[PDB]
Ligand binder design. Structure first.
Ligand code: ZN
Ligand code: ZN
Ligand code: ZN
Ligand code: ZN
Lengths: 103, 387, 56, 49, 139, 49, 106, 74, 159, 93, 62
């Protein structure tokens, strides 16, 4: 997730005065601190990761649905602190995957 | 009255004389001083009035009746050039020399959205909450730019983060917060800015800033009068015509008529050849103002987007829902809905992908951990990779 | 903004002079357009004539 | 003093015997670099018209 | 000579009135005004002829010029070609106070000056013409 | 740091009358010209023909 | 420092307006007997088009600017700012009509 | 001494006082050539040093200017 | 073989046709409109768009590429822009020719002062060479100082 | 290689040597021309392999010429003075 | 003077012959739907369409 984070415009806006390698280090530290939220921050880019060896044989909608159901399962396993999600937009990434909610 | 005061033949003449730049008011004051000093003498300065205008640089206009009076008035002055660069002002120009300027805008209206010329908030849209009576400054509603301890991106004032990074916040009212000497009202900065720091015309609004400003009023973009005016201005200015374009007429006696642009002269007169069932009418060319022309888009024509999020996208028109036009793209190969004001009939794409992305053509790009490929075709926001 | 005909004539003659001396700065019977150093401006016409011109 | 100083220095350095802005349509070559290839050439250059 | 020119100009006046009536009726019937544009070249050629100015002022063709310049009741302005040709003709002819009194073109000129859909160049020319026509009255 | 030498300039003398013959394609057949220079400073003032 | 009197159109230094008042408008404005707020509301330092008049009676410019009945001196074609509503009503009480010189009214 | 007198006049009326301001040029003083360094010191210059350091072998010229303040009331 | 490959066939020039450039052609061949006198954006590289050194006009730098054709400095030929004038002006090289044409035609109704009815005019018409034809027509119509309302039957003249 | 040397090579009749001197040993350049307007206004992206004269609105009638760079400069300077030198690869009659 | 003022009024009119035309012109010069304020492809991304309100109001998991 760090290699995609360092090029994301969100990271560039967050840290305008920092080079790419600093963003790579920040991505690594954020991945260590919370892997789930770092995977969530990729948004559409997380379907291009190496998930399975034969993941290219599936239709795109099938892969997206499988990934989304896995995220819903894992997020509802973990739980979301609603006040933090309301205040910190970084933690609000898991709120659409809460059971009964959506984007 | 005002209309009766227009000049006549028997009114005193007006002469204009070129002077050095920046000394016009100095010449005016010197002429007034000499007129006052020589008043009541044997040879008084036989003039009547003298003035100058800031816009008409390098010109000083004196109202008199004799050229010798002008020579006497200019005698003893150093700002006047060596040659007698004097001319007779036409009588019709007398009213024009004293006509006012900047009338378009009686005054700045409170609540309008304006852009900032310079400063740390250079280019950010700001709402005119208050207009100072002096007219040199005005208090404005802005989006704060702070790092809380080269400028940070604009964002609504976060009181909690400000307190965490700096616990020296002061409070005076409810919803009115003072942080770092700057007054923030419910997340929006209220700071006075000078008149010379603002753009009050040709203002281009964005959905993001509009939503960010109207979010605090608990009703999304509730206000749409100035926004509609900005839409009208952008729609009128963005329309550019070319020969051979099929256009339709909105007003005038020739309303609801189709025609093809034959030639374009300047940017306000367009000669159009109309199409109709009568052959004798089809052989006539009519020059029509651009303000009463609307482009005609037929189904199945290559059109290139002028401006917007889908800029430089080409394709074939599929559905024409009046103002809104739908077309299948060429690059993304998907249907895109863009307004008809943003379309130009370009039969070929010829899109250059230079100065985009991070990838030259035929670059060997690592797709993921264990995948690699070569860029085959490049697009504005996508790439084609051969594994 | 505002149109005193004399000022229009002056500025439009200045524009005509600039466009004319951009192409031909050897116009007989009028002064040449000069650089800030005092040397005359090298027009397009002077690039094409003489021993050192484009052709020869 | 820079007027006289610069005018004299420019005219002697470049050979244009006039005002610097008036270099066009002015006499040139009034001042030249002294020839020092041999003694006789220096004498000849010092006695030239 | 002059009588033949007067007869031809009166015939042109009748043709212009008939064309204006036909175009107004067609506009009321949902059809564009085409007759005025068709008659425009002949009217332009006649107006550009300098020696016919005296006969034009004698026959009061400026009344029909005002009628063409008069906006139709649907609040639709005439074609820009008609306005430009008539303004150029007005500039090319020496219109006096008596001719203005006979024709009443000042009302339409004031309307064109005050209107905003009219081109600003036409606005400036109308202002200049109004100033020139007010010039002899006060001196 | 560059050695510069002034070259003597040759000019016609002032305050002397010189009579010349104008060429054939001209109404003038002879001319008598004098150039006048004040003794103090030796500077040209006026030319009279 | 100079300010342009909104009503009559004359231009004088602001300290002159405070200490002595407007020589022409003193019959209806009482600028000398007025505080700094009223002076600012009737004299503006932001103006354009300096005008010097020698003979008010015969100058067509003075008649066009409606200053032919005033003291000769520095005058402004356009003055930024308008008179307040209370001062306008007070002038209407005196029977004098106020015509703005801001250019926006014509 | 060709043009030894610059003259400025001002018939001030602001009590008529006709004031003439004029300056006269006097003697010319010359010196031997001198060299002024960046640190501010000065010393006599010789041509070999001027050749080596790319200086100009020149000497200052001084002129006596006398100012007088003429005034006549008439 | 010192040039990179191109699929366009290689031919030689057989004819050069001269002429004037029309405003429509100038607008059509242009790639950008020039309206900003300032050469540099903010004196911090990256020249201003719409200025006299717009990057679409071509690249004259080693490391930069043209934003119009995408080619390098060695291959890019350069591209033209246009600049709309507020008022029309004379082309300095054609002013005497404009004067002669003005003499040749009528300033009110844009027609030649003489028609083919005059046999000398017909003879002037017959010569194929445009320069000599113009010279003959000008030598004839220069004398004629009045547009003819009727035929010397109306020829369309305004008189 | 001045003008007199050019005349001497003309007098020798060696056209190939003259062409090689003035092109291969000097500013040899390659341009693209529209087959309709005959102007050097083609926008060629050789690696993208797309040619287009936007004015004439054609993509197929386009040729390449080998001309001196000074000739290209001369034609562009003429175009700057509103003259239109059109290069065609066929005769008309 | 009054007589020439009346003559000027007769020649140039008081404007009432076309004041109603001017009022109609000003009325037609003067005039909100988000479908016309921004592009549908921008409305959809910002969840501003009617279908997003239908999804948000319906009592079912999204
Ligand atoms: Zn006052
Ligand atoms: Zn290029
Ligand atoms: Zn004619
Ligand atoms: Zn072409």
């Amino acid at each position: 997730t760090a290699r995609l984070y360092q090029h994301s415009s969100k990271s560039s806006a967050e840290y305008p005065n920092r080079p790419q390698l600093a963003k790579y280090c920040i991505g690594l530290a954020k991945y260590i601190q919370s892997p789930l939220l770092e995977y969530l921050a990729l948004d559409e880019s997380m379907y291009s990761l190496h998930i399975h060896k034969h993941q290219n044989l599936l239709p795109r909608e099938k892969l997206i649905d499988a990934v989304q159901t896995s995220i819903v399962d894992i997020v509802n396993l973990v739980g979301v602190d609603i006040n933090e999600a309301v205040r910190a937009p970084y933690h609000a990434l898991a709120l659409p995957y809460v059971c009964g909610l959506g984007p | 009255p005002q209309r009766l005061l227009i000049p006549t033949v028997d009114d005193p003449g007006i002469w204009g004389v070129k002077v050095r730049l920046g000394k016009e008011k100095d010449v005016v004051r010197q002429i007034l001083k000499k007129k006052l000093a020589r008043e009541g003498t044997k040879n008084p300065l036989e003039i009547y009035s003298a003035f100058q205008r800031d816009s008409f640089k390098g010109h000083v206009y004196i109202e008199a009746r004799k050229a010798e009076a002008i020579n006497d008035a200019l005698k003893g002055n150093v700002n006047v050039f060596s040659n007698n660069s004097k001319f007779l002002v036409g009588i019709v120009e007398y009213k024009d020399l004293l006509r006012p300027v900047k009338s378009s805008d009686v005054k700045l209206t409170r609540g309008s959205y304006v852009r900032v010329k310079n400063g740390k908030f250079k280019g950010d849209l700001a709402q005119v909450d208050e207009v100072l009576e002096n007219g040199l400054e005005a208090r404005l509603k802005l989006v704060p730019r702070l790092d809380y301890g080269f400028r940070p991106a604009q964002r609504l004032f976060s009181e909690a983060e400000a307190r965490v990074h700096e616990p020296t916040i002061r409070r005076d009212r409810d919803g009115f917060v003072t942080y770092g000497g700057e007054e923030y009202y419910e997340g929006f900065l209220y700071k006075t800015f000078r008149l010379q720091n603002l753009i009050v015309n040709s203002i281009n609004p964005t959905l993001n800033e509009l939503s960010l400003f109207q979010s605090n009023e608990e009703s999304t973009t509730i206000d749409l009068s100035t926004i509609a005016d900005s839409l009208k201005e952008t729609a009128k200015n963005l329309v550019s015509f070319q020969p051979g374009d099929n256009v339709e007429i909105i007003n005038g006696e020739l309303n609801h008529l189709t025609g093809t642009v034959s030639s374009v002269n300047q940017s306000t007169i367009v000669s159009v050849r109309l199409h109709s069932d009568d052959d004798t009418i089809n052989s006539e060319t009519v020059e029509i103002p651009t303000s009463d022309l609307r482009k005609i888009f037929n189904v199945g024509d290559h059109v290139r987007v002028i401006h917007g999020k889908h800029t430089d996208d080409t394709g074939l028109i599929v559905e024409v829902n009046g103002d809104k036009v739908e077309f299948i793209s060429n690059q993304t190969k998907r249907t895109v809905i863009v307004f008809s004001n943003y379309l130009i009939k370009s039969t070929d794409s010829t899109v250059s992908i230079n100065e985009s992305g991070r990838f030259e053509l035929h670059d060997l790009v690592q797709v993921n951990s264990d995948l690699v490929g070569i860029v085959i075709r490049a697009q504005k926001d996508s790439f084609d990779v051969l594994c | 903004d505002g149109s005193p005909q004399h000022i229009i004539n002056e500025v439009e003659q200045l524009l005509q002079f600039h466009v004319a001396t951009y192409m031909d700065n050897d116009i007989a019977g009028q002064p040449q357009a000069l650089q800030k150093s005092g040397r005359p401006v090298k027009a397009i016409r002077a690039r094409l004539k003489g021993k050192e011109g484009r052709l020869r | 003093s820079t007027t006289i100083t610069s005018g004299l220095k420019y005219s002697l350095a470049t050979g244009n015997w006039g005002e610097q802005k008036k270099a066009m349509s002015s006499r040139a070559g009034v001042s030249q670099v002294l020839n020092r290839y041999t003694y006789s050439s220096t004498l000849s250059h010092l006695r030239r018209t | 000579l002059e009588q033949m020119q007067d007869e031809l100009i009166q015939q042109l006046k009748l043709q212009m009135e008939e064309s204006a009536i036909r175009d107004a009726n067609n506009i009321e019937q949902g059809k564009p005004a085409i007759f005025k544009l068709k008659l425009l070249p002949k009217v332009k050629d006649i107006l550009l002829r300098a020696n016919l100015a005296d006969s034009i002022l004698d026959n009061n063709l400026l009344a029909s010029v005002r009628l063409w310049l008069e906006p139709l009741p649907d609040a639709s302005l005439p074609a820009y070609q008609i306005q430009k040709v008539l303004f150029d003709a007005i500039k090319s002819l020496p219109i006096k106070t008596s001719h203005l009194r006979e024709s009443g073109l000042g009302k339409v000129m004031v309307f064109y000056q005050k209107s905003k859909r009219v081109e600003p160049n036409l606005k400036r020319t109308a202002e200049k013409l109004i100033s020139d026509w007010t010039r002899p009255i006060m001196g | 740091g560059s050695e510069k030498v002034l070259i003597a300039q040759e000019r016609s003398a002032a305050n002397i009358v010189q009579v010349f013959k104008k060429a054939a394609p001209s109404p003038i057949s002879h001319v008598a010209e004098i150039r006048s220079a004040l003794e103090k400073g030796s500077r040209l003032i006026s030319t009279m023909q | 420092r100079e300010r342009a009197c909104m009503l009559c159109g004359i231009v004088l230094p602001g300290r002159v307006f405070m200490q002595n008042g407007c020589p022409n408008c003193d019959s209806v404005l009482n600028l000398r007997d007025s505080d700094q707020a009223t002076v600012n509301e009737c004299t503006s330092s932001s103006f354009e088009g300096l005008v010097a008049v020698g003979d008010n009676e015969h100058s067509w410019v003075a008649k066009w600017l409606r200053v032919d009945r005033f003291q000769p001196g520095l005058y402004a074609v356009r003055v930024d700012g308008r008179l307040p509503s209370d001062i306008v009503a007070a002038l209407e009480q005196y029977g004098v009509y106020y015509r703005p010189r801001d250019g926006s009214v014509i | 001494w060709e043009e030894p007198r610059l003259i400025l006049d001002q018939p001030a009326q602001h009590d008529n006082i006709n004031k003439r301001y004029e300056i006269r040029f006097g003697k010319i003083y010359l010196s031997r050539p001198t060299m002024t360094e960046a640190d501010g010191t000065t010393h006599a210059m010789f041509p070999q040093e001027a050749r080596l350091r790319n200086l100009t072998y020149s000497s200052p010229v001084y002129l006596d200017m006398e100012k007088s303040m003429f005034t006549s009331i008439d | 073989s010192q040039f990179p490959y191109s699929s366009a066939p290689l031919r030689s020039v057989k004819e050069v046709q001269f002429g004037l450039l029309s405003p429509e052609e100038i607008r059509a061949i242009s790639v950008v409109k020039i309206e900003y006198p300032e050469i540099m954006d903010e004196s911090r590289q990256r020249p201003r768009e719409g200025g006299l050194n717009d990057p679409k006009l071509g690249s004259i730098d080693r490391n930069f590429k043209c934003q119009t054709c995408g080619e390098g400095m060695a291959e890019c030929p350069g591209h033209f822009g246009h600049m709309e004038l507020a008022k029309p002006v004379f082309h300095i090289g054609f002013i005497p020719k404009i004067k002669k044409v003005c003499e040749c035609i009528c300033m009110n109704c844009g027609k030649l002062l003489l028609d083919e009815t005059n046999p000398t005019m017909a003879q002037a018409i017959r010569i194929r060479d445009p320069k000599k034809r113009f010279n003959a027509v000008w030598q004839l119509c220069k004398t004629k100082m009045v547009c003819e309302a009727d035929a010397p039957v109306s020829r369309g003249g305004c008189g | 290689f001045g003008e007199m040397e050019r005349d001497c090579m003309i007098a020798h009749g060696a056209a190939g040597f003259l062409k090689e001197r003035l092109m291969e040993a000097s500013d040899a350049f390659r341009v693209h021309v529209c087959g309709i307007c005959g102007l050097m206004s083609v926008i060629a992206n050789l690696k993208k392999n797309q040619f287009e004269c936007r004015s004439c609105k054609n993509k197929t009638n386009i040729y390449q010429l080998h001309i001196p760079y000074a000739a290209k400069l001369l034609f562009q300077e003429l175009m700057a003075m509103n003259i239109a030198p059109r290069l065609y690869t066929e005769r008309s009659g | 003077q009054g007589e020439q003022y009346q003559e000027i009024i007769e020649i140039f009119g008081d404007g009432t012959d076309y004041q109603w035309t001017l009022d109609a012109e000003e009325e037609m010069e003067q005039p909100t739907s988000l479908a016309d304020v921004f592009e549908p492809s921008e409305l959809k991304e910002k969840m501003l369409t009617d279908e997003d309100n239908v999804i948000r109001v319906t009592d079912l998991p999204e």
